[PDB]
Design a protein around this ligand. Structure first.
Ligand code: ADP
Ligand code: ADP
Ligand code: ADP
Lengths: 435, 427, 52, 27, 440
């Protein structure tokens, strides 16, 4: 399935200049060679809070360039595609969404080492003692290497009881999280009973006591929401997730402050590695004046990531003010903090080659005559409309017994289907009949 | 069984041929050849599901078959393909935002069918022994072809005692989990025959091998996945009112894991359709979100029925065609529905009256078509059942012209009530 | 037809041991000695049932 | 009705009474 | 207690056997064109065939919309459910607007369900095992049956039960000389304590000794439940009990409706069909009376003719009072009757006429008869006269205070002077409006 897959990179030469036909992107050469500097800045890991505004008429590739920016940096750096309509949340403060997205666009790759206990359990004798709670528990795990006994806390024994485990089965234990899973009974006892509800898993290999390093990559918003909405095993605090489980509002001292301090403590000791992200806030032109005004302090923060806005309107009334208008629907105070990037409106040839590129993406064999007729049909309409009469055309050609698409196919598909402009006149004609 | 017929129960699917050529009055769809052909094309595009993120709008005069075409597509689509019908006004919820409602609606039409090959047993219980003191027992299952004896274990015995099955019952034993699902009773009865008991019912015993490898399937929607994965509240995806999904911690993870499952072949894809009726109710923010919500491989196609013309967009003061901004209207291609002619309205009324099991004379058809052409089609359709009641009340057989003419004077359609609204009731 | 048996393999005596007992009740009102009224109480000191 | 007026408490402060030893057998 | 209301006089539409409205019958008078129009929809409801039909009672204020609207519930009878609601009940703080509409739509669809179950009661006299001649090898005898003797006020009978019933009894820990409860269809055995008749002395323990159950030991009586689709929906939505800690959240208010349609297409809406086709339940489609519909928001109006197009929906009897008025929630829209043109296109409008002096006089007489007032012929005539000036409401409301003044003045019937004195103490809307316009 492909909806915006034709874009796979800015398609730029080593000198930054945009390669006319490359990476499935054609046209907008200036905008792409400009976004080259943006991606170079993002890979530098030096600046913070720099904003960009991809401005242009509808269907001009600003979003295409935004996704090509993500494709250029790769899947290693975090990318957070966000629409301007996600801020109008009813369960949490409006500015909270913006701040948690700014925090969520910051990545944190932290290598971690953890231990693991596993094998076939031989016996489990809970050490009894007077307090009159169970003191400890001796568990013997037999593996292909050897059999060893170990003492664990009563919480692990309780968890095992939750699993309803018995003596002689296979279990997986983790001392870091404390979660103990039930992989099933040992495999050698498959011949014991005729048929049972237990699952049989081969005797775990390797040493009973084994460790391993895991190179995990997460974001700071994950730690923020984990410290704001804690979780754990065998703790009644989980009740918070049943009666007190609305969306959280991490205070300043928690969103900032302590989380940053602990992350710096992890970094400066050689365990973590910072990776900036890219916050692509599309359809920013419809945010509230409050959001625009908070973006001031949001971007000026030394932690804020590189933001790439994308406006569509030319000059309209700012939402939330109801009386004042500004370019792009964004107030001028915020517009001074962004590096606006133009987006040229596509020309007949550029549009034709865009249609061509899009055709070969989702396995469509279009003939040259039909391709050229699509150019004629497009110069009268928008590119996004002319680039969509391909899948219906291919499906209709598959019905006519023709392997390819001809003139008549796209002419009948262009007749069954109308477009915005061609359908607006139909309503203007029958004005007092549509209600 | 008893689910009374509705205004759209008469259409059983688009009356199309194998070449997407709409027939005049086949399969309940009357006239409207162009829009029906367009809907057939988009449906053929739906049953293929190799591109996701497209939209198609059906516009026309009020009462021309927009929702009718939507229901026809829904019916011709059949099950095994999620179809979600929602009105534009349903997303204005108080427990979640508009964008959240739209995401839920979209993901509710994306199905994930995990094929599971679980081996089980299926046979008639002949004898069961269980030695209570751990406890041990045995089981004997019979099928039409063979029989065998089983040496039940402790947990199998516990499960069978929880089910407390007895001889003669036909059951299925999941070798993996041990779940006992009893389909009924074989030709056996009389536990004591002297104690009280309900009536006995019997069914044939299973056939073929006792143990056989069958194929179960679990089909759930992406919305249900994100839901049960949202939080640890047990048995979610029903929970009567509550969805507060998180964007990254859940949604992106669901998408990634579904992609991984498609990669190895656990459950690849089954896209659906989201028919958003009366989409003019959506706010400017809803369209702003829809702009980029369609730009995703997990964005199923949506169908919108519009009745408005050049009218301001809700939530603002911007005049735009179809009450939809030209930003979202740039993707979706529009389909036009032609007003039904005399012979089209007449045949529509004929089919709709034959659906309600009412007989109307030849002149009844003519007078009702006259009314439904001077008046709206919906009123002429509503006058089919109203006139079918006076006839029965007079012990009649088929609706005549007099019954229709009387029930027409009994009620007012849209204009005979506003024209009489000359008393200055209240304003 | 499906019958149902429960056998006490240990010993037939346990066939009756489980459904053992049958101690039907045989109480009656203990009319008081003073006014011959239906007794409602039992003096802890005398243990004699009284009513007033 | 039984508010246990003050003077009743002062009076209750008197030495306690002995417990009984009931073992009668008669009508 | 009666507690006479404002509409406790309408007993029905008053239609004859031929479907023609009588001039005055069943409390209603006049409005023949309307009482005959809204009578066809009664048969429409009694057919249980159509779904989503709508009839709009559009007329001036006080003409009788609510009068002959709730009278349909009388003709239809109380057996079919009738869910009335005013247009102001949609606005809620914990449930979205368009959802209250759906919740009321399913509350009007009733579903009566019937079940038959045998029942056992009485003091158990003895429970002796029935011997099975060594079914297995030579270990010991086996319980093939258990002879149980139950004592009741009618008689004492011995009965046999299965060995599984014997195990259930043994684990239940009951003894002899007590009252038990058996249900052979399911097999579960419940206990009702001992027999209060002979088993308990004057002791204090409230073991809930049930008296010797009166009646036959064996009894069967079909239980007839009357559950609506909304009741079962809320039940599957807000479970009850004292387990499954998720259900233990009884401290929270939990008003959280907005039943997701997944639970509709799935549960009860499906088991309803599986019980109907099975011959256990009978669907009883009811009425959904929505008066003051002009109060619904534009979103509500839009959702209305989407829920009315569903195969599962009851009839709707709207009552619009406003004339050409602006739709609530929009601007510069002058849709007639305060209802959008699109929705008016889907409803059958019944126009009620304006009452003449004689009809209002009959209405006043009927309301006086209902309230129990012994109004005289002169007082009635004067009330009709002064009601031809103002509306019928004020005219007919001057029966209780006038009767009080009469009783206070040593009377048993409202006289011509009593309503005149009350007519000066109280005045109608127009008089107060003029008095206000004359003042500041
Ligand atoms: N550089 C490009 N190369 C090829 N196609 C493009 C390019 N830019 C835009 N398009 C086409 O335009 C369509 C919509 O572009 P979009 O990213 O929505 O622009 P906007 O954000 O201005 O609406 C896409 O389907 C895409 O095929
Ligand atoms: N193609 C069709 N075939 C049969 N009946 C139709 C058709 N189109 C519309 N109708 C009739 O019109 C009535 C209402 O149509 P509707 O779906 O409301 O049109 P619209 O969506 O334009 O308002 C239905 O009761 C239906 O019987
Ligand atoms: N057909 C009728 N027969 C008897 N009384 C009527 C009739 N119609 C109206 N009324 C009386 O008029 C009063 C107000 O009418 P109501 O139905 O509340 O007005 P509306 O329905 O127009 O708001 C009622 O209390 C009722 O007693």
């Amino acid at each position: 399935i492909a909806s915006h897959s034709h874009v796979k990179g800015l398609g730029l030469d080593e000198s930054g200049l945009a390669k006319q036909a490359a990476s499935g992107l054609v046209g907008q050469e200036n905008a792409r060679e400009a976004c080259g500097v943006i991606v170079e800045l993002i890979k530098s890991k030096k600046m913070a809070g720099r904003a960009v505004l991809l401005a242009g008429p509808p269907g001009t590739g600003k979003t295409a360039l935004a996704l090509a920016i993500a494709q250029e940096l790769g899947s290693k750096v975090p990318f957070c595609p966000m629409v301007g309509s996600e801020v109008y949340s009813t369960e949490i403060k409006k500015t909270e969404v913006l701040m948690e997205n700014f925090r969520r666009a910051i990545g944190l790759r932290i290598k971690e080492t953890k231990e693991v206990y596993e094998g076939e359990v031989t016996e489990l004798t809970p050490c009894e003692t007077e307090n009159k709670t169970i003191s400890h528990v001796i568990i013997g795990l037999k593996t292909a290497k050897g059999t060893k006994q170990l003492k664990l806390d009563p919480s692990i024994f309780e968890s095992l009881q939750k699993e309803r485990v018995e003596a002689g089965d296979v279990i997986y234990i983790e001392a870091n999280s404390g979660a103990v899973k039930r992989q099933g009974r040992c495999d050698t006892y498959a011949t014991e009973f005729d048929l049972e509800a237990e699952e049989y898993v081969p005797l775990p290999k390797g040493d009973v006591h084994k460790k391993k390093e895991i190179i995990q990559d997460v974001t700071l918003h994950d730690l923020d929401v984990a410290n704001a909405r804690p979780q754990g095993g065998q703790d009644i605090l989980s009740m918070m997730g049943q009666l007190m489980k609305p969306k959280k509002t991490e205070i300043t001292d928690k969103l900032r402050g302590e989380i940053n301090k602990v992350v710096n403590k992890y970094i400066d000791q050689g365990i973590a590695e910072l990776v900036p992200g890219v916050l692509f806030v599309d359809e920013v032109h419809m945010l509230d004046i409050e959001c625009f005004t908070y973006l001031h302090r949001a971007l000026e923060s030394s932690i804020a990531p590189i933001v790439i806005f994308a406006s569509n309107r030319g000059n309209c009334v700012i939402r939330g003010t109801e009386d004042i208008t500004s370019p792009h629907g964004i107030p001028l105070d915020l517009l001074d903090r962004v590096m606006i990037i133009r987006t040229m409106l596509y020309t007949p040839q550029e549009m034709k080659q865009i249609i061509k590129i899009r055709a070969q993406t989702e396995g469509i064999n279009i003939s040259e005559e039909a391709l050229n007729h699509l150019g004629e049909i497009g110069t009268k309409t928008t590119l996004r409309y002319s680039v969509q009469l391909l899948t219906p055309a291919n499906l209709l050609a598959k019905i006519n017994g023709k392997d390819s698409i001809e003139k008549e196919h796209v002419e009948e598909i262009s007749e069954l289907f109308y477009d915005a402009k061609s359908s607006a006149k139909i309503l203007a004609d029958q004005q007092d009949k549509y209600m | 069984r008893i689910e009374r017929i509705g205004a759209h129960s008469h259409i059983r699917g688009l009356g199309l041929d194998d070449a997407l050529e709409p027939r005049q009055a086949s399969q309940g769809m009357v006239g409207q050849l162009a829009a029906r052909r367009a809907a057939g094309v988009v449906l053929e595009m739906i049953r293929e599901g190799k591109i996701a993120g497209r939209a198609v709008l059906i516009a026309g005069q009020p009462g021309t078959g927009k929702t009718a075409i939507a229901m026809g597509m829904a019916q011709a689509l059949g099950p095994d393909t999620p179809f979600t019908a929602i009105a534009g006004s349903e997303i204005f919820s108080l427990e979640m935002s508009k964008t959240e409602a739209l995401t839920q609606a979209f993901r509710r039409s994306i199905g994930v069918r995990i094929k599971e090959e679980t081996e089980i047993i299926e046979g008639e219980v002949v004898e069961i022994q269980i030695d209570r003191p751990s406890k041990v027992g045995k089981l004997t299952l019979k099928t039409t072809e063979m029989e065998t004896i089983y040496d039940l274990g402790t947990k199998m015995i516990e499960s069978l005692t929880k089910d407390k099955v007895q001889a003669g019952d036909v059951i299925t034993i999941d070798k993996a989990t041990g779940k006992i699902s009893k389909l009924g009773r074989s030709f056996t009865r009389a536990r004591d025959y002297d104690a009280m008991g309900s009536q006995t019912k019997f069914v044939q015993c299973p056939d073929g091998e006792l143990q056989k490898r069958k194929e179960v399937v679990h089909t759930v929607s992406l919305h249900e996945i994100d839901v049960i994965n949202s939080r640890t509240q047990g048995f979610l995806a029903l929970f009567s009112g509550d969805t507060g999904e998180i964007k990254s911690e859940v949604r992106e993870q669901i998408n990634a894991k579904v992609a991984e499952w498609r990669e190895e072949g656990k459950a690849e894809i089954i896209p659906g359709v989201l028919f958003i009726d009366e989409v003019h109710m959506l706010d400017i923010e809803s369209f702003s979100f829809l702009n980029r919500a369609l730009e995703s491989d997990m964005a199923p196609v949506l169908i919108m029925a519009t009745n408005r013309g050049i009218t301001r967009i809700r939530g603002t003061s911007y005049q735009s065609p179809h009450g939809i901004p030209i930003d979202l209207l740039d993707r979706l291609l529009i389909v036009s529905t032609t007003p039904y002619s005399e012979k089209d309205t007449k045949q529509i009324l004929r089919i709709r009256c034959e659906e309600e099991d009412v007989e109307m004379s030849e002149d009844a058809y003519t007078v009702l078509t006259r009314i439904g052409l001077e008046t709206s089609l919906r009123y002429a359709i509503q006058l089919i059942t109203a006139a079918s009641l006076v006839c029965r009340k007079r012990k009649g057989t088929e609706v005549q012209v007099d019954d229709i003419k009387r029930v027409y004077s009994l009620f007012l359609d849209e204009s005979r009530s506003t024209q009489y609204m000359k008393e200055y009731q209240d304003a | 037809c499906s019958r149902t048996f429960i056998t006490f393999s240990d010993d037939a005596t346990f066939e009756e041991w489980f459904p053992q007992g049958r101690p039907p009740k045989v109480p009656v009102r203990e009319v008081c000695p003073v006014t011959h009224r239906p007794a409602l109480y039992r003096d802890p000191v005398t243990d004699i049932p009284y009513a007033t | 009705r039984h508010r246990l007026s003050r003077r009743v408490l002062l009076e209750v402060a008197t030495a306690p009474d002995p417990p009984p030893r009931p073992k009668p057998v008669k009508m």
